[PDB]
Coordinates of C-alpha atoms in Angstrom, one line a residue:
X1 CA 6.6 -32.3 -43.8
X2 CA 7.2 -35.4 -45.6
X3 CA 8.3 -38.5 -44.6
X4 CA 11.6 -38.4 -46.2
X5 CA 11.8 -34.7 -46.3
X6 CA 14.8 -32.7 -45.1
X7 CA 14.3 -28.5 -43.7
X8 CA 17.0 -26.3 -45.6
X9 CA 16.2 -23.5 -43.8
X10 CA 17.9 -22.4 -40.1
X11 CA 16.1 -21.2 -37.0
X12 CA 15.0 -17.5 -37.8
X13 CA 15.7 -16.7 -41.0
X14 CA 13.1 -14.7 -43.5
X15 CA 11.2 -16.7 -45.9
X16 CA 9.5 -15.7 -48.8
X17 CA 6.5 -16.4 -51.4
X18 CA 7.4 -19.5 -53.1
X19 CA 11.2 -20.2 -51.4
X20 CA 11.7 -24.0 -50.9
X21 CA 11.8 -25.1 -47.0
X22 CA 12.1 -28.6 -47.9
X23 CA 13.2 -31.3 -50.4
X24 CA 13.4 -34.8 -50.9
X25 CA 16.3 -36.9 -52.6
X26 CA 15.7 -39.5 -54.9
X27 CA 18.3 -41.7 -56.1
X28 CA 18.5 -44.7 -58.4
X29 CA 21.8 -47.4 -57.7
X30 CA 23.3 -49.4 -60.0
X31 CA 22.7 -46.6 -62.5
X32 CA 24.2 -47.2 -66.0
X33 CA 23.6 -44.5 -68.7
X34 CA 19.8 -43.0 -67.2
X35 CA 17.5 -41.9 -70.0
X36 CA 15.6 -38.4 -70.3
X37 CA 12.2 -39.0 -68.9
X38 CA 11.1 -35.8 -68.7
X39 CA 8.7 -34.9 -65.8
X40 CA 7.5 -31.3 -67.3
X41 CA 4.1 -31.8 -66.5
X42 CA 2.5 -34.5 -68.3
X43 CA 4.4 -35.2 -71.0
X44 CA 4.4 -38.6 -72.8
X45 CA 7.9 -39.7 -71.8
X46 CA 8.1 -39.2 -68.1
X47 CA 9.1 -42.8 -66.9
X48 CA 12.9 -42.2 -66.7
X49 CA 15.0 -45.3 -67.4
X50 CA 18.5 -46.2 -66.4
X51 CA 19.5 -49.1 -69.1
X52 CA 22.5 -50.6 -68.4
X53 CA 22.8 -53.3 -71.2
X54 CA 22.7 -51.5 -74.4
X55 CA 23.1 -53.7 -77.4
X56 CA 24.1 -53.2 -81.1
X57 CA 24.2 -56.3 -82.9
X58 CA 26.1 -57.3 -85.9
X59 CA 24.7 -58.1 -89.3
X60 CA 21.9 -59.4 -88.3
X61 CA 18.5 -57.7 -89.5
X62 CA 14.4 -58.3 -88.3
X63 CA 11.8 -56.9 -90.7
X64 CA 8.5 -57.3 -91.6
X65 CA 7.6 -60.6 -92.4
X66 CA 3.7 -61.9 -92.5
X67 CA 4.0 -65.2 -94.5
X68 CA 3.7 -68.7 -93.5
X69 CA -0.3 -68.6 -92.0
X70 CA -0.1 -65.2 -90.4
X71 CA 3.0 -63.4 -89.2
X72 CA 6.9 -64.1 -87.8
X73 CA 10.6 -62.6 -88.0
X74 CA 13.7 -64.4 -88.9
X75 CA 17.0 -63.6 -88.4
X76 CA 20.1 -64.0 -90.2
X77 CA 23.5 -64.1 -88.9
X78 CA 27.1 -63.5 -91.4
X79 CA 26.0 -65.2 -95.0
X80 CA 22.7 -65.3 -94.3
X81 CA 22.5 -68.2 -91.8
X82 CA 18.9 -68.4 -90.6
X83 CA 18.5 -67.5 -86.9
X84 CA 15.0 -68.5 -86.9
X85 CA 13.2 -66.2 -84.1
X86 CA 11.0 -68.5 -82.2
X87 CA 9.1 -66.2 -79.7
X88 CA 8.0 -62.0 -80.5
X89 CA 10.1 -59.2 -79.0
X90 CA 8.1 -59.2 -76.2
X91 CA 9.2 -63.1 -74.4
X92 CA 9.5 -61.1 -71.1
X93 CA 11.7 -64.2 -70.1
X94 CA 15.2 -63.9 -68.3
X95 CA 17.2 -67.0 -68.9
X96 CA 17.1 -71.0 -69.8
X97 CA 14.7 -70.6 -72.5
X98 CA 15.5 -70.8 -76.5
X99 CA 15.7 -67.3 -78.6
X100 CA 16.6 -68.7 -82.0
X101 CA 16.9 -71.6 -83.8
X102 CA 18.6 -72.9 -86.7
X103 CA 18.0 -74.5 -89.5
X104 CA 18.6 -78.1 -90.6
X105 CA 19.4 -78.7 -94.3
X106 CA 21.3 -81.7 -93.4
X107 CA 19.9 -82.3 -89.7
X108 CA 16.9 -82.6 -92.2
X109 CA 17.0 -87.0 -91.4
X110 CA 15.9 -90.1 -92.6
X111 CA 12.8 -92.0 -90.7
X112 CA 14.8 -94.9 -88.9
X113 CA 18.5 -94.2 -87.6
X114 CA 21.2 -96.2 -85.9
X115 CA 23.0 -93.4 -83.8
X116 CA 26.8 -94.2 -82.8
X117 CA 27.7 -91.6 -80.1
X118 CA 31.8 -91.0 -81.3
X119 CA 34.2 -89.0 -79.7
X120 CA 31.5 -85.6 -79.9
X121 CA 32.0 -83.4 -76.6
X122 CA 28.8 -83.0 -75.8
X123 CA 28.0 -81.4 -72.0
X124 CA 27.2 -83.7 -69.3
X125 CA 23.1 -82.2 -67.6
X126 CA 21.1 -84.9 -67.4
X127 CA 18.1 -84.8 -69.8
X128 CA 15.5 -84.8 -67.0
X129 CA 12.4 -84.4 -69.6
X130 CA 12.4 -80.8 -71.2
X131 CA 16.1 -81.3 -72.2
X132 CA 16.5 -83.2 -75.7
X133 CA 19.5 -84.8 -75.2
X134 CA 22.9 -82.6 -74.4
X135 CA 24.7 -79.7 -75.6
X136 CA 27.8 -80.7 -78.1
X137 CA 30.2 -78.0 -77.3
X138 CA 33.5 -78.3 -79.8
X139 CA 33.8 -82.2 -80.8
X140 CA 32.8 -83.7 -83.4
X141 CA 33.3 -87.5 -85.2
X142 CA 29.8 -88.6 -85.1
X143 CA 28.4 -91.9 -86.7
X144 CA 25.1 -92.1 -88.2
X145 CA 23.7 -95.4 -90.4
X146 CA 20.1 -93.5 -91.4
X147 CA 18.4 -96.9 -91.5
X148 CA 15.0 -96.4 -92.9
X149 CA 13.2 -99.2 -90.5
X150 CA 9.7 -98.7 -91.4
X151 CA 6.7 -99.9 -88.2
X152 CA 4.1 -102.3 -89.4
X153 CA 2.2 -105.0 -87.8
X154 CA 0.6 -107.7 -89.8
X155 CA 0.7 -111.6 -90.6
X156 CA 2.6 -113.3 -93.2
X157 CA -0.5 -114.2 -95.4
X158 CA -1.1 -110.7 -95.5
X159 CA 2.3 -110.2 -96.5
X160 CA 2.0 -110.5 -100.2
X161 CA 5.2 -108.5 -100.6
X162 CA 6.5 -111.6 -98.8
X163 CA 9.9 -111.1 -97.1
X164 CA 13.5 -111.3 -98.1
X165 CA 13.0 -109.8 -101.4
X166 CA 13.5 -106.4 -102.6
X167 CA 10.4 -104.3 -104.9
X168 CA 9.0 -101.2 -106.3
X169 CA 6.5 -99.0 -103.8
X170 CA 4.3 -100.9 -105.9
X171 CA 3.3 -103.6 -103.0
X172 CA 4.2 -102.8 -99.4
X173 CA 5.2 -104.5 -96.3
X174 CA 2.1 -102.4 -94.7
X175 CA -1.1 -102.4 -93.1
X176 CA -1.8 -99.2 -92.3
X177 CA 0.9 -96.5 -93.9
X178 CA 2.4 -96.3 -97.5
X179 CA 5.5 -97.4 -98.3
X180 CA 8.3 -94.9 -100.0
X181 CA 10.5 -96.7 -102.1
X182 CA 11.9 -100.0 -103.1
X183 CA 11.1 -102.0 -100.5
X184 CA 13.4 -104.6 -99.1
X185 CA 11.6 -107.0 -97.1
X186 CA 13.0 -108.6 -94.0
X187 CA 10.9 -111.1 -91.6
X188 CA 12.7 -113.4 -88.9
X189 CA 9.9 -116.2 -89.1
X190 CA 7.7 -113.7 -87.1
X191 CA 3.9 -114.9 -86.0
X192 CA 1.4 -113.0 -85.1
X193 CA 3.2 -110.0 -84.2
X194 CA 6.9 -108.6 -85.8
X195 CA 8.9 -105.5 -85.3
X196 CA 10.0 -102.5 -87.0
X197 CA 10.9 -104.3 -90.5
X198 CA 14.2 -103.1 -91.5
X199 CA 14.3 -101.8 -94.9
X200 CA 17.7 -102.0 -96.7
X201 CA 17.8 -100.9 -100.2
X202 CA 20.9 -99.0 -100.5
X203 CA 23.7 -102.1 -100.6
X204 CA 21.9 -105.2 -101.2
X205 CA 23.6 -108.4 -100.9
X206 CA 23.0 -112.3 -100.2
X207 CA 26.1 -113.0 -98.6
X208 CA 25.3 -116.2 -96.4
X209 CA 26.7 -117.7 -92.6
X210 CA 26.9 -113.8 -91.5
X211 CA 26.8 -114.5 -87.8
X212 CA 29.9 -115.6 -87.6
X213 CA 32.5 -112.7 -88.9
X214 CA 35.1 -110.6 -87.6
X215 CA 33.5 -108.0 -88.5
X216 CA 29.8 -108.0 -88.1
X217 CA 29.5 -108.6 -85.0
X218 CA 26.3 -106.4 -83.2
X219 CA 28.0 -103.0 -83.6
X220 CA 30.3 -103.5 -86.7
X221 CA 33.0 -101.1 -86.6
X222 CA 33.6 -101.2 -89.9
X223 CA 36.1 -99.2 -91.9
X224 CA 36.0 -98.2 -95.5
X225 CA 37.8 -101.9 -96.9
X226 CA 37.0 -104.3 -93.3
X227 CA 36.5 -107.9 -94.8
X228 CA 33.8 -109.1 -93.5
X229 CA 34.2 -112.3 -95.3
X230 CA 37.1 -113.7 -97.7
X231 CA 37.0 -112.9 -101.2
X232 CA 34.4 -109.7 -101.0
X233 CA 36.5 -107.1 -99.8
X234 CA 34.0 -103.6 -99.3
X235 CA 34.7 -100.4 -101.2
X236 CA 32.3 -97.6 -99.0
X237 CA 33.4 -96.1 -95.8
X238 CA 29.6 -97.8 -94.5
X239 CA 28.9 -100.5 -91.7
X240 CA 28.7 -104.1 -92.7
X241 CA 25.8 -105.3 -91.5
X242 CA 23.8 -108.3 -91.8
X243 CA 20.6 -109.1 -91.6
X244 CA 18.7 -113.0 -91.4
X245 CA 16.8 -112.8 -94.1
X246 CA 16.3 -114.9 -97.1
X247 CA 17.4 -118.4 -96.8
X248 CA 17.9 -118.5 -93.2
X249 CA 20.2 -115.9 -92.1
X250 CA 21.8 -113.5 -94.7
X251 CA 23.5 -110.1 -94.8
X252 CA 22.5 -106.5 -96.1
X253 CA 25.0 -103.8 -95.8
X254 CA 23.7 -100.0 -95.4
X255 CA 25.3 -96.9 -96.1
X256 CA 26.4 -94.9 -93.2
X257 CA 27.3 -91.2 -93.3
X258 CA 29.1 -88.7 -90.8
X259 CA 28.0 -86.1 -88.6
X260 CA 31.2 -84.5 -87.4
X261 CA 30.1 -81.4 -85.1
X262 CA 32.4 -78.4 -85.5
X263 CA 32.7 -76.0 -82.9
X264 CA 29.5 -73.8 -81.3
X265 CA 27.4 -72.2 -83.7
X266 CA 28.8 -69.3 -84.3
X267 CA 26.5 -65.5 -82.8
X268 CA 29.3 -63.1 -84.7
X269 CA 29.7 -60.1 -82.8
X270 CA 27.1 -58.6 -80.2
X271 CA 27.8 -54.9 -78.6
X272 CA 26.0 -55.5 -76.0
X273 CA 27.4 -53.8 -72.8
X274 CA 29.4 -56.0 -70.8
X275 CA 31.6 -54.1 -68.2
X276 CA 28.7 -51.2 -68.1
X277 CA 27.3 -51.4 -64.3
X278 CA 28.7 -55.1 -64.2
X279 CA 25.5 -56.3 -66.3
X280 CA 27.4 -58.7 -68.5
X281 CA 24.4 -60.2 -71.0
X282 CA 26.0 -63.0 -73.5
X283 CA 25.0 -65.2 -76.3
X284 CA 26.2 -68.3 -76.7
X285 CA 24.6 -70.4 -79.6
X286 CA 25.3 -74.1 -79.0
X287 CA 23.9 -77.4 -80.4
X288 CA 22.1 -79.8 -79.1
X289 CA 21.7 -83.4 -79.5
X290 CA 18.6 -86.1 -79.0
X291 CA 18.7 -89.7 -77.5
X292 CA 22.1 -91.7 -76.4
X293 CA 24.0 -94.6 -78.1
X294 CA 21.1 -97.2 -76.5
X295 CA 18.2 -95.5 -78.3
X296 CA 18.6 -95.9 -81.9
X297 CA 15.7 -94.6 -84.1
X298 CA 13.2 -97.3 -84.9
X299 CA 10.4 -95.1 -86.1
X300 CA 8.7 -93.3 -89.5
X301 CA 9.4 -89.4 -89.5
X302 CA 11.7 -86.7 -90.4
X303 CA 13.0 -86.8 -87.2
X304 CA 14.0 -83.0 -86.1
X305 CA 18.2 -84.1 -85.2
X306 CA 20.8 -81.7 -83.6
X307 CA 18.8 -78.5 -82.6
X308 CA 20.8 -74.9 -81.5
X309 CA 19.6 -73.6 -78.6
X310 CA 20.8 -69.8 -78.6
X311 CA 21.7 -69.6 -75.0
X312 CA 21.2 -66.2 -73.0
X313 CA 24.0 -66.6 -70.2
X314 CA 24.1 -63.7 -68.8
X315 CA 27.2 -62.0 -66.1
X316 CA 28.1 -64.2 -62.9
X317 CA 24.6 -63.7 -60.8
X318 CA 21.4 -61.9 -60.6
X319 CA 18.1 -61.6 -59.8
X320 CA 16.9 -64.3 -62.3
X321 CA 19.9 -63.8 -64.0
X322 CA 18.8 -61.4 -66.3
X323 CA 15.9 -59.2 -65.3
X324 CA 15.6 -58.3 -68.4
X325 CA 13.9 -57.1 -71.7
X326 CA 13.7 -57.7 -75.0
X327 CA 12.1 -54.8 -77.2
X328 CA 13.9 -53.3 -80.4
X329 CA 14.7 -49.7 -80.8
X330 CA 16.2 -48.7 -84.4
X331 CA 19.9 -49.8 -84.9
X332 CA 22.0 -46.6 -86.6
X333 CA 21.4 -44.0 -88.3
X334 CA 20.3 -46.0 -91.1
X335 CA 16.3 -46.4 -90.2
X336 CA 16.7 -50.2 -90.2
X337 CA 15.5 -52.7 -87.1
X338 CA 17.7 -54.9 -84.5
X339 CA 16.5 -56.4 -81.7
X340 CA 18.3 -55.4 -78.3
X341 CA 18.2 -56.8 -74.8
X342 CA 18.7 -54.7 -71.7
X343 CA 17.8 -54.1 -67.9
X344 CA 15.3 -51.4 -66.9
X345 CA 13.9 -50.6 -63.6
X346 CA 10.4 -48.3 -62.8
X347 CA 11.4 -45.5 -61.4
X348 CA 7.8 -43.5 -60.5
X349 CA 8.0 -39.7 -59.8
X350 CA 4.1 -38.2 -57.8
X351 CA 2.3 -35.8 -59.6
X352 CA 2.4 -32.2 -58.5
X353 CA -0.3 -31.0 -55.3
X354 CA -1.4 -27.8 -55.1
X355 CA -2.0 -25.7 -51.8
X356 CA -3.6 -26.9 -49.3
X357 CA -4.9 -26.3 -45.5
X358 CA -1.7 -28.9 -43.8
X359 CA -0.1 -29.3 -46.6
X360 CA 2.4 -27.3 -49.3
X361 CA 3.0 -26.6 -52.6
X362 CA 5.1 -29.8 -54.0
X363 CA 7.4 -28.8 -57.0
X364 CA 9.7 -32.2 -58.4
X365 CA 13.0 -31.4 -60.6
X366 CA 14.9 -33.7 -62.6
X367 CA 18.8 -32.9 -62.0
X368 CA 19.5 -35.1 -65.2
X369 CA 19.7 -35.3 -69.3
X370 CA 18.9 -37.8 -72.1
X371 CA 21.9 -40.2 -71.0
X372 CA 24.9 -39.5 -69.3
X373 CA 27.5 -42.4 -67.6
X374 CA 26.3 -42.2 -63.7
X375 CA 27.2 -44.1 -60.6
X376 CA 25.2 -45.7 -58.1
X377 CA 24.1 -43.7 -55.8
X378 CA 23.3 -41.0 -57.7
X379 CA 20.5 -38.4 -57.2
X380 CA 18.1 -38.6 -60.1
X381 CA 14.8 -36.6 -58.9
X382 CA 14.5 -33.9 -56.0
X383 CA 10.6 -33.1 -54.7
X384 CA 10.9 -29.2 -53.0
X385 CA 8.2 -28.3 -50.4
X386 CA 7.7 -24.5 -50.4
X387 CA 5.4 -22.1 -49.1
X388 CA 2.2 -20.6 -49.5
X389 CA 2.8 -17.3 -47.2
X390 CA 5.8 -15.0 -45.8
X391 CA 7.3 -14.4 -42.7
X392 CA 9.3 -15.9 -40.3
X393 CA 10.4 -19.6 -39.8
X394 CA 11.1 -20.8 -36.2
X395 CA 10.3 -23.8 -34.0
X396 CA 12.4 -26.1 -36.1
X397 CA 12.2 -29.1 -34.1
X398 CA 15.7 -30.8 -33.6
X399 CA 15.0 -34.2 -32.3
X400 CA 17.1 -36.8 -33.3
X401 CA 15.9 -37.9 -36.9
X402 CA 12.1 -37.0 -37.0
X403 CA 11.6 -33.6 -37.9
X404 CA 8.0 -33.7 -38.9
X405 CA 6.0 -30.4 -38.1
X406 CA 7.6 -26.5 -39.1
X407 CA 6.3 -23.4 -38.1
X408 CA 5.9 -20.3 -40.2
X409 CA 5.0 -16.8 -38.0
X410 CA 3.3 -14.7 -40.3
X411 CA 2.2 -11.5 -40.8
X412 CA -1.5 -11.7 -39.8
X413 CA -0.6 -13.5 -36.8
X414 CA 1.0 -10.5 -35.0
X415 CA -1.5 -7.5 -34.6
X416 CA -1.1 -4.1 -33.8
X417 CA -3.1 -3.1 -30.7
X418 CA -2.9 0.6 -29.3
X419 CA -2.9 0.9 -25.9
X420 CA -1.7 2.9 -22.9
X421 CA 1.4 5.1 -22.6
X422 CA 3.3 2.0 -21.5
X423 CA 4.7 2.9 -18.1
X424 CA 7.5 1.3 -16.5
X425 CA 5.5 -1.6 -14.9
X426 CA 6.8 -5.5 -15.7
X427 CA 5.4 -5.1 -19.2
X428 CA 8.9 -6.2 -21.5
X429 CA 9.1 -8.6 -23.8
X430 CA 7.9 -12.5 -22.6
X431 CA 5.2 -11.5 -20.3
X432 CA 2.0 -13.1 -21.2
X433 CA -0.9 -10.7 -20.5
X434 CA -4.7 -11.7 -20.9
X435 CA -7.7 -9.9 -21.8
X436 CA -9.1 -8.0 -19.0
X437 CA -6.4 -8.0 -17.1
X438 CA -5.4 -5.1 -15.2
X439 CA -2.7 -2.4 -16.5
X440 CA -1.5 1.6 -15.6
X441 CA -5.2 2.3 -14.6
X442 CA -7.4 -0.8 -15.0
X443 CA -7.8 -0.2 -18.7
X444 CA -9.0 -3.5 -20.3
X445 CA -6.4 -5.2 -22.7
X446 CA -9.1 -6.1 -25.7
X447 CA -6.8 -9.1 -26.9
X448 CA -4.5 -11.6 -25.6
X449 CA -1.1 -13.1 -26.2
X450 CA 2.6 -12.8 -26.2
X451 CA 4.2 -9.2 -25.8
X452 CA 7.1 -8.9 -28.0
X453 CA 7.5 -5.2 -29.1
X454 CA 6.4 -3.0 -27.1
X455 CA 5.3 0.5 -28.8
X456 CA 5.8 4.0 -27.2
X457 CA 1.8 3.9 -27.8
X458 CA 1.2 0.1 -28.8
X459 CA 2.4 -3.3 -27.3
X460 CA 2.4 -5.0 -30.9
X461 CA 1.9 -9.0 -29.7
X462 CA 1.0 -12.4 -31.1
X463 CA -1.8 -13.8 -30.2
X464 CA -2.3 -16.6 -28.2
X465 CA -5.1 -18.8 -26.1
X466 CA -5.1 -19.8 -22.3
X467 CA -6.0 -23.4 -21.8
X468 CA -6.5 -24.0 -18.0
X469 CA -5.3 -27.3 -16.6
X470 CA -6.5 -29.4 -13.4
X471 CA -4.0 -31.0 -11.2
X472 CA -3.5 -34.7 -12.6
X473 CA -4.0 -34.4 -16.3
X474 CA -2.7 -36.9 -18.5
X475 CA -0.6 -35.1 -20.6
X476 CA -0.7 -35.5 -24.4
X477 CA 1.8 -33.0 -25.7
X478 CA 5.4 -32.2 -24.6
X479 CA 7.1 -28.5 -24.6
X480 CA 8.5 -26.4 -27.0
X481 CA 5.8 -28.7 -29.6
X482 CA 3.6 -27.7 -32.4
X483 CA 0.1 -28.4 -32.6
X484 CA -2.7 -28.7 -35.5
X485 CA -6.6 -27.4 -35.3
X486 CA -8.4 -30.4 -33.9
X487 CA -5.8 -31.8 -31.6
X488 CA -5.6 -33.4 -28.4

């Protein structure tokens, strides 16, 4: 028998061509909706799956998209918003890692930046390197002067677009790079080595004795009409700012916009199961955001700002918190694509054997259909041993929990022998008599074995082998036991 097997059969009871003795139980937990998988020989879907995350998303739609180099899909979420899908269907991650991103038609920036962290609930998770900067949940009233401070290192005779004086692209404050438009100059009497000059074009001005105001003072705070100094009272919402310039120190102002963050980035509606087999999968897409208040940008780039991680938090806890997939089936009826997300689970079913010498004929059934709402603990597969003769079934070991070995008495076994009248001698059913043994007159028996019907001409018996033991043998086998050819 099998390992896991179970006999269905009882002590004595007649047994057929191709009845099932035995059969084997499989069961699947957790078991959300099982699929078909059908095991009728070797057909192409036999792997049965349980799923127990099922999603249907939302407008939201993936197609067939080969252009920029080679190949990609993008998403799109309500209007239209672009849900840029970073990795394939096939990620085969669980959790932490980025599915979408979105776009940045504003977050599109400048190449300097002066960032003033204000009042934005961002999340508190240290960056610790692969991080870039925190997650802003709901707030928003962020401050952002774009600055365009623009990197260069050279000497003042090489300056010949001098310093503290505003030009075309024409000439450049540069060495190395181009410049991008009129260029402001601004050196602090600098020699043999400067900093990031700091171009200000959009709100020129020569207002003089700026380090001294109530206003410009190293991080401003300036409204839309704060005097910085009597008689010029400003007009724009932007920071006054100065910066020493021509004729010793002077002041440049430079517009300032708003970031305000409105609540998460909105994933609209996912039917993904939730309650189903308490595998709770969730999307969350929230923002992110780059260096603190201390950092302010100083270099030449686009600079990629706030970025929208499409978070995969997933129920309370689990093995890797997802143990997941990520392949797309159709969506509806209408033959159009959408990707889902749900939990599967191998479950492997043996091929069939054939007959064989120790072994039987191994028939697995499937007791389920192409989905139906299970619980765990639930028997998906039974594996029936049958037989490969008739007869009888006896010596059904009961032990405690290891019946291993059955015994089938059939026909061929038992033989008919004819023999004497059968007198009234001890001859009845148990005796065991062996050839040449004596009998009425001496007459030879021409077999041996076990008597169990005894004939009014025959003594019909099974067959059986005397095996002489010594005194002091070291047993091997115990009663009542079955044996195979080739055993100790």
């Amino acid at each position: 028998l099998l390992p896991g097997a179970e006999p269905t059969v009882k002590n004595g009871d007649r047994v057929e061509v191709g009845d099932v003795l035995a059969e084997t139980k499989l069961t699947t937990e957790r078991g959300g909706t099982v699929r078909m998988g059908e095991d009728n020989g070797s057909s192409t879907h036999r792997e049965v799956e349980i799923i127990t995350a099922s999603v249907v998303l939302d407008t939201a739609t993936v197609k067939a998209e080969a252009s920029q180099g080679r190949e990609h899909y993008v998403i799109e979420t309500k209007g239209g918003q672009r849900f840029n899908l970073l990795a394939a269907p096939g990620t085969k991650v669980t959790t932490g890692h980025v599915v979408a991103e979105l776009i940045d038609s504003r977050y599109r920036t400048q190449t300097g930046g002066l960032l003033k962290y204000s009042g934005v609930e961002i999340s508190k998770k240290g960056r610790a390197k692969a991080k870039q900067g925190y997650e802003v949940t709901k707030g928003g009233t962020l401050l952002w002067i774009p600055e365009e401070t623009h990197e260069v290192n050279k000497d003042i005779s090489l300056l010949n677009v001098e310093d503290g004086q505003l030009v075309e692209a024409g000439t450049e404050v540069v060495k190395d790079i181009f410049c991008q438009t009129t260029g402001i100059v601004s050196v602090t009497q600098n020699n043999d080595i400067l900093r990031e000059i700091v171009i200000k074009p959009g709100d020129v001005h020569v207002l003089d004795d700026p380090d001294t105001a109530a206003k410009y003072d190293e991080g401003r705070l300036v409204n839309a009409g704060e005097e910085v100094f009597p008689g010029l009272t400003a007009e724009q919402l932007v920071w006054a700012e100065a910066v020493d310039g021509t004729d010793g120190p002077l002041l440049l102002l430079r517009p300032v916009q708003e970031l305000v963050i409105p609540d998460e980035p909105p994933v609209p509606s996912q039917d993904s199961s939730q309650e189903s087999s308490s595998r709770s999968i969730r999307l969350r897409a929230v923002q992110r955001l780059q260096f603190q208040d201390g950092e302010r940008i100083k270099s030449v780039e686009g600079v990629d700002l706030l970025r929208t991680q499409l978070v995969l938090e997933s129920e309370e806890g689990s093995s890797q918190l997802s143990a997941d997939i990520e392949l797309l089936p159709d969506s509806k009826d209408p033959e159009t694509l959408r990707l889902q997300l749900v939990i599967i689970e191998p479950v492997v079913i043996r091929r069939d054997v054939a007959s064989d010498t120790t072994h039987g004929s191994t028939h697995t059934e499937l007791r389920v259909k192409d989905g139906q709402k299970v619980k765990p603990g639930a028997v998906i597969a039974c594996t029936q041993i049958q037989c490969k003769e008739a007869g009888v079934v006896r010596g059904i070991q009961e032990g405690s929990e290891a019946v291993r070995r059955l015994l089938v008495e059939r026909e061929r076994d038992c033989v008919t022998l004819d023999l004497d009248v059968t007198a009234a001698t001890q001859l009845q059913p148990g005796s065991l008599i062996v050839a040449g043994t004596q009998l009425v007159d001496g007459i030879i028996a021409p077999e041996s074995g076990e008597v169990r019907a005894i004939a009014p001409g025959q003594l019909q018996l099974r067959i059986a082998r005397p095996y002489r033991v010594s005194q002091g043998a070291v047993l091997h086998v115990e009663d009542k036991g079955l044996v195979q050819r080739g055993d100790n």
